[PDB]
Design an enzyme around this catalytic site. Sequence first.
Site, PDB file in Angstrom:
ATOM      1  N   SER A 194      51.670  -4.387  11.862  1.00 28.71           N
ATOM      2  CA  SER A 194      51.551  -5.571  12.697  1.00 28.71           C
ATOM      3  C   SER A 194      52.568  -5.539  13.830  1.00 28.71           C
ATOM      4  CB  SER A 194      51.741  -6.835  11.859  1.00 28.71           C
ATOM      5  OG  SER A 194      53.025  -6.855  11.269  1.00 28.71           O
TER       6      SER A 194
ATOM      7  N   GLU B 103      28.755 -28.140  15.683  1.00 30.37           N
ATOM      8  CA  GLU B 103      29.995 -28.593  15.084  1.00 30.37           C
ATOM      9  C   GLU B 103      31.139 -28.151  15.989  1.00 30.37           C
ATOM     10  OE1 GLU B 103      30.508 -27.257  11.107  1.00 30.37           O
ATOM     11  OE2 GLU B 103      32.348 -28.397  10.759  1.00 30.37           O
TER      12      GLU B 103
ATOM     13  N   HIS C 281      46.814  -2.120   8.261  1.00 28.52           N
ATOM     14  CA  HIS C 281      47.766  -1.326   7.498  1.00 28.52           C
ATOM     15  C   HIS C 281      47.974   0.049   8.110  1.00 28.52           C
ATOM     16  CE1 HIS C 281      49.062   1.405   4.273  1.00 28.52           C
ATOM     17  NE2 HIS C 281      49.672   0.357   3.749  1.00 28.52           N
TER      18      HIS C 281
ATOM     19  N   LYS D 101      57.367 -17.138   3.263  1.00 26.08           N
ATOM     20  CA  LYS D 101      56.951 -17.736   4.525  1.00 26.08           C
ATOM     21  C   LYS D 101      55.460 -18.049   4.491  1.00 26.08           C
ATOM     22  CE  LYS D 101      58.833 -17.039   9.166  1.00 26.08           C
ATOM     23  NZ  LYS D 101      59.743 -16.138   9.916  1.00 26.08           N
ATOM     24  N   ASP D 102      54.681 -17.156   3.875  1.00 24.04           N
ATOM     25  CA  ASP D 102      53.278 -17.446   3.629  1.00 24.04           C
ATOM     26  C   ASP D 102      53.115 -18.709   2.808  1.00 24.04           C
ATOM     27  OD1 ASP D 102      52.227 -15.370   5.079  1.00 24.04           O
ATOM     28  OD2 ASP D 102      51.895 -14.052   3.362  1.00 24.04           O
TER      29      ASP D 102
HETATM   30  C1  HEM Z   1      38.947 -14.302   7.590  1.00 22.70           C
HETATM   31  C2  HEM Z   1      39.392 -13.976   8.804  1.00 22.70           C
HETATM   32  C3  HEM Z   1      40.597 -13.033   9.008  1.00 22.70           C
HETATM   33  C4  HEM Z   1      41.502 -12.601   8.122  1.00 22.70           C
HETATM   34  C5  HEM Z   1      41.609 -12.952   6.623  1.00 22.70           C
HETATM   35  C6  HEM Z   1      42.418 -11.723   8.812  1.00 22.70           C
HETATM   36  C7  HEM Z   1      43.499 -11.071   8.260  1.00 22.70           C
HETATM   37  C8  HEM Z   1      44.644 -10.756   8.951  1.00 22.70           C
HETATM   38  C9  HEM Z   1      45.978 -10.587   8.419  1.00 22.70           C
HETATM   39  C10 HEM Z   1      46.385 -10.717   6.940  1.00 22.70           C
HETATM   40  C11 HEM Z   1      46.799 -10.293   9.426  1.00 22.70           C
HETATM   41  C12 HEM Z   1      48.314 -10.039   9.312  1.00 22.70           C
HETATM   42  C13 HEM Z   1      49.035 -11.360   9.528  1.00 22.70           C
HETATM   43  C14 HEM Z   1      48.964 -11.715  10.985  1.00 22.70           C
HETATM   44  O1  HEM Z   1      49.167 -10.804  11.825  1.00 22.70           O
HETATM   45  O2  HEM Z   1      48.696 -12.898  11.308  1.00 22.70           O
HETATM   46  C15 HEM Z   1      46.011 -10.255  10.635  1.00 22.70           C
HETATM   47  C16 HEM Z   1      46.434 -10.032  11.925  1.00 22.70           C
HETATM   48  C17 HEM Z   1      45.541  -9.961  12.971  1.00 22.70           C
HETATM   49  N1  HEM Z   1      44.376 -10.711  13.175  1.00 22.70           N
HETATM   50 FE1  HEM Z   1      43.196 -11.056  11.628  1.00 22.70          FE
HETATM   51  N2  HEM Z   1      42.021 -11.646  10.131  1.00 22.70           N
HETATM   52  C18 HEM Z   1      40.904 -12.439  10.281  1.00 22.70           C
HETATM   53  C19 HEM Z   1      40.187 -12.642  11.436  1.00 22.70           C
HETATM   54  C20 HEM Z   1      40.541 -12.188  12.681  1.00 22.70           C
HETATM   55  C21 HEM Z   1      39.787 -12.349  13.907  1.00 22.70           C
HETATM   56  C22 HEM Z   1      38.436 -13.086  13.989  1.00 22.70           C
HETATM   57  C23 HEM Z   1      40.479 -11.772  14.896  1.00 22.70           C
HETATM   58  C24 HEM Z   1      40.151 -11.633  16.399  1.00 22.70           C
HETATM   59  C25 HEM Z   1      38.949 -11.916  16.904  1.00 22.70           C
HETATM   60  C26 HEM Z   1      41.668 -11.215  14.313  1.00 22.70           C
HETATM   61  C27 HEM Z   1      42.663 -10.556  14.977  1.00 22.70           C
HETATM   62  C28 HEM Z   1      43.832 -10.190  14.356  1.00 22.70           C
HETATM   63  C29 HEM Z   1      44.700  -9.171  14.892  1.00 22.70           C
HETATM   64  C30 HEM Z   1      44.470  -8.392  16.201  1.00 22.70           C
HETATM   65  C31 HEM Z   1      45.713  -9.032  14.058  1.00 22.70           C
HETATM   66  C32 HEM Z   1      46.915  -8.086  14.210  1.00 22.70           C
HETATM   67  C33 HEM Z   1      48.038  -8.995  14.695  1.00 22.70           C
HETATM   68  C34 HEM Z   1      49.268  -8.220  15.057  1.00 22.70           C
HETATM   69  O3  HEM Z   1      49.469  -7.115  14.503  1.00 22.70           O
HETATM   70  O4  HEM Z   1      50.051  -8.724  15.897  1.00 22.70           O
HETATM   71  N3  HEM Z   1      41.689 -11.493  12.966  1.00 22.70           N
HETATM   72  N4  HEM Z   1      44.704 -10.551  10.308  1.00 22.70           N
HETATM   73  C1  HEM Z   2      33.818 -17.993   5.965  1.00 24.79           C
HETATM   74  C2  HEM Z   2      32.781 -18.277   5.173  1.00 24.79           C
HETATM   75  C3  HEM Z   2      32.083 -19.653   5.213  1.00 24.79           C
HETATM   76  C4  HEM Z   2      32.177 -20.607   6.145  1.00 24.79           C
HETATM   77  C5  HEM Z   2      32.990 -20.581   7.456  1.00 24.79           C
HETATM   78  C6  HEM Z   2      31.362 -21.721   5.723  1.00 24.79           C
HETATM   79  C7  HEM Z   2      31.161 -22.892   6.415  1.00 24.79           C
HETATM   80  C8  HEM Z   2      30.225 -23.857   6.112  1.00 24.79           C
HETATM   81  C9  HEM Z   2      29.997 -25.087   6.838  1.00 24.79           C
HETATM   82  C10 HEM Z   2      30.754 -25.565   8.093  1.00 24.79           C
HETATM   83  C11 HEM Z   2      29.017 -25.749   6.235  1.00 24.79           C
HETATM   84  C12 HEM Z   2      28.461 -27.117   6.669  1.00 24.79           C
HETATM   85  C13 HEM Z   2      28.442 -28.057   5.470  1.00 24.79           C
HETATM   86  C14 HEM Z   2      28.367 -29.486   5.928  1.00 24.79           C
HETATM   87  O1  HEM Z   2      28.513 -29.744   7.149  1.00 24.79           O
HETATM   88  O2  HEM Z   2      28.159 -30.370   5.062  1.00 24.79           O
HETATM   89  C15 HEM Z   2      28.580 -24.975   5.101  1.00 24.79           C
HETATM   90  C16 HEM Z   2      27.577 -25.324   4.233  1.00 24.79           C
HETATM   91  C17 HEM Z   2      27.338 -24.724   3.024  1.00 24.79           C
HETATM   92  N1  HEM Z   2      27.975 -23.589   2.576  1.00 24.79           N
HETATM   93 FE1  HEM Z   2      29.487 -22.558   3.489  1.00 24.79          FE
HETATM   94  N2  HEM Z   2      30.774 -21.397   4.522  1.00 24.79           N
HETATM   95  C18 HEM Z   2      31.206 -20.139   4.173  1.00 24.79           C
HETATM   96  C19 HEM Z   2      30.852 -19.462   3.032  1.00 24.79           C
HETATM   97  C20 HEM Z   2      30.034 -19.943   2.038  1.00 24.79           C
HETATM   98  C21 HEM Z   2      29.764 -19.302   0.773  1.00 24.79           C
HETATM   99  C22 HEM Z   2      30.324 -17.955   0.281  1.00 24.79           C
HETATM  100  C23 HEM Z   2      28.932 -20.070   0.090  1.00 24.79           C
HETATM  101  C24 HEM Z   2      28.401 -19.749  -1.313  1.00 24.79           C
HETATM  102  C25 HEM Z   2      27.575 -20.600  -1.918  1.00 24.79           C
HETATM  103  C26 HEM Z   2      28.639 -21.238   0.886  1.00 24.79           C
HETATM  104  C27 HEM Z   2      27.820 -22.275   0.523  1.00 24.79           C
HETATM  105  C28 HEM Z   2      27.463 -23.313   1.330  1.00 24.79           C
HETATM  106  C29 HEM Z   2      26.482 -24.311   0.990  1.00 24.79           C
HETATM  107  C30 HEM Z   2      25.688 -24.357  -0.328  1.00 24.79           C
HETATM  108  C31 HEM Z   2      26.408 -25.163   2.002  1.00 24.79           C
HETATM  109  C32 HEM Z   2      25.484 -26.391   2.065  1.00 24.79           C
HETATM  110  C33 HEM Z   2      26.316 -27.596   2.477  1.00 24.79           C
HETATM  111  C34 HEM Z   2      26.058 -28.762   1.569  1.00 24.79           C
HETATM  112  O3  HEM Z   2      25.115 -28.714   0.743  1.00 24.79           O
HETATM  113  O4  HEM Z   2      26.815 -29.755   1.677  1.00 24.79           O
HETATM  114  N3  HEM Z   2      29.330 -21.129   2.073  1.00 24.79           N
HETATM  115  N4  HEM Z   2      29.337 -23.822   5.055  1.00 24.79           N
END
Ligand code: HEM
Ligand code: HEM
Lengths: 85, 181, 39, 291, 383, 244, 48, 72, 122
Positions: free
Chosen positions: D206, D272, D202, D228-229
């Site tokens: 963007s 994975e 912000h 669009k979202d």
């Molecule tokens: C839960 C994960 C993430 C959320 C919710 C998030 C959120 C956002 C949002 C709402 C936007 C604006 C819409 C868009 O530009 O697509 C944005 C843009 C962006 N995302 Fe993320 N982001 C995440 C993770 C990441 C990661 C892991 C990276 C890079 C390693 C990244 C890099 C960017 C950048 C650089 C922008 C700016 C894009 C631009 O202005 O052209 N984001 N992000």
């Molecule tokens: C970006 C955030 C998160 C990611 C990317 C993520 C991703 C994952 C993944 C890939 C697994 C493997 C499960 C399987 O292979 O069966 C897992 C397991 C699990 N996650 Fe998440 N997780 C997130 C956040 C959370 C949160 C906030 C909770 C809160 C309780 C949670 C609870 C669990 C539990 C309880 C398991 C055990 C899987 C099972 O019992 O089947 N995770 N998570």
Amino acid sequence: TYMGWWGSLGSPKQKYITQYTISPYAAKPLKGAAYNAVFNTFRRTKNQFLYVAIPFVVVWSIWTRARDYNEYLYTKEGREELERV
Amino acid sequence: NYQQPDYSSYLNNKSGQGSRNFTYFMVGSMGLLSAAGAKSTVEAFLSSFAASADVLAMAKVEVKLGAIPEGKNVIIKWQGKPVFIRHRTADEIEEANQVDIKTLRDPQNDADRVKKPEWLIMLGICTHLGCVPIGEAGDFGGWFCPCHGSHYDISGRIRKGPAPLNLEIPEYDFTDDETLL
Amino acid sequence: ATIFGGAFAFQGFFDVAVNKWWEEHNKAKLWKNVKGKFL
Amino acid sequence: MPTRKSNTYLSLVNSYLIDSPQPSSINYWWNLGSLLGLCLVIQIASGVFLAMHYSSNIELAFDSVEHIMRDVNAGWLIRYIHANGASFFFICMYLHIGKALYYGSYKQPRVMLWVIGVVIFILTMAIAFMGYCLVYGQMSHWGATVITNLLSAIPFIGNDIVPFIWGGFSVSNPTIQRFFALHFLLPFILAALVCMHLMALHVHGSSNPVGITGNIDRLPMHPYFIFKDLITVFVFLLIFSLFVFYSPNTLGHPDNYIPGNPMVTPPSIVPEWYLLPFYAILRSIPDKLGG
Amino acid sequence: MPTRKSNTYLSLVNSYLIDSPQPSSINYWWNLGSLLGLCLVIQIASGVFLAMHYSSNIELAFDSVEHIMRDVNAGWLIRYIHANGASFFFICMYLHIGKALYYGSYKQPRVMLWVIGVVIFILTMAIAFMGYCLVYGQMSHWGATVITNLLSAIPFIGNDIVPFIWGGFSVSNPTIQRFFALHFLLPFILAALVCMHLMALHVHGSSNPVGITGNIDRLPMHPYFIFKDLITVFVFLLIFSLFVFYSPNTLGHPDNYIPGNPMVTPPSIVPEWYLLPFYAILRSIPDKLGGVIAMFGAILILLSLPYTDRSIIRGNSFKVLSKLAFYLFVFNFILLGNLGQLHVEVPYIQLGQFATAYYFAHYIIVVPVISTLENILYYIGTQ
Amino acid sequence: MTAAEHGLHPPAYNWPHNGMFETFDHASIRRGFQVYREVCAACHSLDRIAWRNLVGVSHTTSEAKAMAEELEYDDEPDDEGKPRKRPGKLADYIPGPYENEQAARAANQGAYPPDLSLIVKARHGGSDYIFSLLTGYPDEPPAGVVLPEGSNYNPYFPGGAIAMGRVLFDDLVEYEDGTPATTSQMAKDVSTFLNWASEPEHDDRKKWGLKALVVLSSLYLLSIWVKRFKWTPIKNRKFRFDPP
Amino acid sequence: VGVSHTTSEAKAMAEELEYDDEPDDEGKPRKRPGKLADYIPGPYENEQ
Amino acid sequence: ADPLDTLREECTKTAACKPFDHHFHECIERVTKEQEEPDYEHKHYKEDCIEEFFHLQHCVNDCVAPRLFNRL
Amino acid sequence: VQSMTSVVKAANFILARPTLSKIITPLAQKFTAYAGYREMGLKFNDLLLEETPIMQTAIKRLPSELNYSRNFRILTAHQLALSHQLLPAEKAVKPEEDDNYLIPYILEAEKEAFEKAELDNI
Ligand code: HEM
Ligand code: HEM
Ligand code: HEC
Ligand code: HEM
Ligand code: HEM
Ligand code: FES
């Protein structure tokens, strides 16, 4: 809003007021802490005592009467009165 | 411009450096006392991450040793990692008699890898990406790391594969028909 | 930084002081002093 | 002023959703961020409903997962979501990094933003891996084992840090319990990091597919790029349903359904799918510390 | 501009911690806010370190807590911190409500803040109660059972909502597991509510012990009210250490160290002390539905307070009758808390009914009547 | 409740470990452990204490291991699969005299002697209560009270009727250190030992508490000084208002 | 029940097997005919 | 002899404990008299000296407590 | 919050009746003396809740000299509460100086607001 940042906190036009102060390093720390914390603290307690004492006295009197009555009920001489209730 | 209020009484009796030095000493002492307290708290908390008393007690647990076929490889569960307790026959000892100062990532011999050929102890966990080697697939005749195909020699030395070292030998001691960890 | 270094100094000072005062205040009660009577 | 600006809470919601002056030339790729946020909700949402039934004890983790699948009313749905939704979370994150790499969204005015991006990435991977270790299947257990063994390569502290990670002398009950706790937790740290991401977005706004400044023609967000979202969100949910309801185990590995047994290593160890690239890099370098 | 203002995150930290224009006349009571935040950290920090060892299964919950106590290296310290720190969290929160009630911190410009406050309070209570249910001692289990049975008093949905709350037909493994999940979670929702509280505070700033506008004389926060917050924080931690290390179980109930047994009820059921007042109110009203409604009103009426307080002058510091009324209300609140732990007996049932009566009467009669009377008395006095 | 149901409130004995800076009299812990094994173990479990917990508290590691040996413990069945038994080791938890609640209730007229590993933190009076319970049995129950068959009168027990009945009698145990074994002394030893078993962190807890009080008190005094110093400019402000 | 067998058939198949119950109040082991809630039993007591 | 018994004997002889002891023995006598009457087992309220015993024991404990452990 | 117009209505309702006046007014002076605000240099109208549009307008429409005097009195009160001290009796605001200076402007603001509300619902 009713409070801005430093430039304009919302205070009215303020004027003719001069504020003086001295550096902390040039001022004696904890000057009258010994005398103040006793005499001024006693003054504050004296001023605020009644407001905490009258409500406290009332509530603690109610609590004491209730507690004493409860103690009296659960005794050999309170058996009849407990039964009546 | 105008008369200031008299601060005469409010003034400190210290010199310019003395008062500043004392103030900085007090602030620094507060900062370092806070650092010490935070260090104590954080270390006490992180010590929770360490092995609890239960885990420590469970480890260093003796294994029920005894007579077993020569050349057979037994398995155990000391400290989780499988233990490849094998009573390699005299043939294995004779084979290990051939020394090797080259073509071996860590040249060694049964002199240090085992106390007596009648009881050979070695953790089954492999070197690179620790895994349980197969007990008969070793290219060198010992254990073989299935993940990378690494071959473990009958003495535990790494013969071929991605092995970074030789097959670890636990710190288990030997006794009269018993394993004394 | 030097904050982490001074943390050692302060923590060690208080730690040794307390370990030396405690084992003196309670020397008659600690196990390391009583085990002899039961040996 | 309108209620959507006078109230501080609604003022924030407006600044980020209703009046955010998005550039008029952004493709559908700019929607990925929203999806990522959506996924962060889903991961949390389904996640919070799995911990209500998941038992972190090593002797109960896999049986507890199977209890979720077989016994809980919609437990199969919640687990398949929480898993395939993590896979889709990483699909959308890789697409969001690819977009930021193709268009120069990482360049000067947004370098700070980019940094949080990377951190998020790193953090996410941990979370995902840690969560996977909770299933305590064969591949779960042995992935944890391989990870900790590799981290055992730190020059001096390596021999000491690993027991602090394992909470013992090998992947066991303390390891699974701490992984469950930190896995429940770190998603909220990631939510905070996402808030920081949005703040850094912000501050400077963007970018554009054309790269040139958007200030000359910027559009509100409520009638534009919120609808669009919605296209992007519904496409995401449609594919997510094609996976969750039909062939939900395609992205996973079958060996993960064999309860973890330290005494038998499976034929192959793979993370994975979304962590496979880095794993490959790890194996490309012979030295463990080097890897 | 300085780095502390140019950077966005450092700009936020500056707005809230370094340059926030606090009034210069604020007492030490205004430090309680900071303490609460600190406590919110402790509850979380120590909390996260207990979930690393706590096993939520019903047949392992109490045994897992004992494993923490006896086996984990500093487990005893973390558990005592997490428990006595919840108790201190509620002490500081009650003090922070008492301050906001004494000084008119709930009045016109800050109503939203006040509202969030109440919500936080509500939410926290749930969290705390849920956390208690995790120990699954006798008192834990039976408190959970009593809460669920009372919630079963909803007119129509009550019979159907409770099995959803239990996840079964009585407090059992699903109930404890879901309580553990919601208890781990809701603290972070509470952190979000705390951030909302801070924004609603920042929009209009904080009040004064004098009540009058502070804009005339405000001070930065970094040199001032940071080292005041350090004094308050170290006093808090000193008392917290007196409790955690010496007599840590003073605030807790001994029966909670008896593993939960559904077949044998303990002699008396009482929450942790900080929930006793409301519990007392709950037992003051005979009808279960009436009891629950009155209990929840006992909190929600704080929302009605900013509108019933018809005083033109903010705060009690300059008001005679209002100070007597406030102290009477505080002592009646303590009396309700005390009655919470006492058995339903001859004098105490009537005393609890009267105490609840006056607890609500404060808000709905005494505050408006006293405030209006004092407004009139002020105006007549000056003329 | 009436005084009887709540149970007579135990007094406050000046335990060696009451004050903020005193440890358990580890001599008393070992003597109480002797009393436990000699008398309690017949009925009470005390499961949560592992033999390893007694190393460095009341027994040398050799003594604790030796004690563990005499007992027998369940072992993973033999290779054929038949049940196996093994000599006890340090990691093992002390075993109760009864296999399950049913056996304990059967052997104690239906009363279930509770596990003692938390009895000190699970009773109102704490250590005092235990002591008061063991030495509270009056020779003649107060006149007028009728006890259910098998129950014994003890005022400190809620309700006045306790199934345990007096156990500690003079010279019932020959203490290792030649300490006299008066019933009062034995009650003191068992109370101290059970308090340890319920609060094994007590010693380290209070030492850490002393360190924390020292550090936080010094830091708090420093904070008072720093705040007063840094606020002197504000508390010394002087204003003037000079309009025309 | 409702997948490949009517509830009566599943129940009957349950009684055809024996399961370990809570031992009698005298402490002796006791066994009961199977019921629907019981899991299908394997032919071996343990992996060994 | 154990110090507790002798301390109890000393304290019950104390002037402060004397009135409670007297009340307790008088109550014992009264309860025995009540038990003498043949319709005792019909009485709804069968008196007992638990309260007097409790008072005596509290007054004796307040004396023995501080002194007991100095003997051990 | 009670509109100042209502406060003055009640005050004149009481003052007009000699019995209620003779009873309350002594208690009114006693209550304003015990209130303790005068010892801190504050007049009554300094205590009024400033954070309201009507009150804010009233302050905005004060004369310059009254505005500066109010600013200095508020600043002095803040300093006194800050240093935990009270003015000596000779320096405290005497009952005669507690002159209700701001009430006329507050009442004018209330009148304007009430007229606007009445006409908006004509
Ligand atoms: C839960 C994960 C993430 C959320 C919710 C998030 C959120 C956002 C949002 C709402 C936007 C604006 C819409 C868009 O530009 O697509 C944005 C843009 C962006 N995302 Fe993320 N982001 C995440 C993770 C990441 C990661 C892991 C990276 C890079 C390693 C990244 C890099 C960017 C950048 C650089 C922008 C700016 C894009 C631009 O202005 O052209 N984001 N992000
Ligand atoms: C970006 C955030 C998160 C990611 C990317 C993520 C991703 C994952 C993944 C890939 C697994 C493997 C499960 C399987 O292979 O069966 C897992 C397991 C699990 N996650 Fe998440 N997780 C997130 C956040 C959370 C949160 C906030 C909770 C809160 C309780 C949670 C609870 C669990 C539990 C309880 C398991 C055990 C899987 C099972 O019992 O089947 N995770 N998570
Ligand atoms: C044989 C029977 C014993 C022996 C040798 C000991 N205990 Fe006890 N005890 C026993 C039972 C069946 C009960 C239950 C009584 C009841 O009414 O439930 C008890 C009770 C206790 C308690 C609990 C007291 C309370 O909860 O108020 C404690 C504490 C206790 N006993 C202590 C204790 C000690 C210190 C012993 C030392 C040898 C001991 N017991 C032995 C049965 C028996
Ligand atoms: C984690 C819990 C809480 C935190 C961290 C928090 C945070 C804060 C902070 C930082 C302040 C400013 C310092 C101060 O005025 O003391 C404040 C003031 C305040 N607190 Fe909270 N708060 C919490 C809970 C509550 C609750 C439960 C209530 C009421 C039910 C409440 C009511 C208030 C109010 C009304 C103010 C404004 C005080 C004023 O301006 O006079 N707070 N709070
Ligand atoms: C303001 C937020 C919180 C409050 C007020 C709070 C309060 C409490 C309380 C009073 C208990 C009872 C424990 C006892 O009496 O022994 C408890 C238990 C517990 N809480 Fe918290 N808690 C909070 C947040 C958290 C968080 C963020 C976690 C993260 C793991 C957590 C984890 C636990 C656990 C695991 C228990 C089980 C108790 C035990 O095993 O001893 N809590 N909580
Ligand atoms: S298996 Fe990966 S190198 Fe041994």
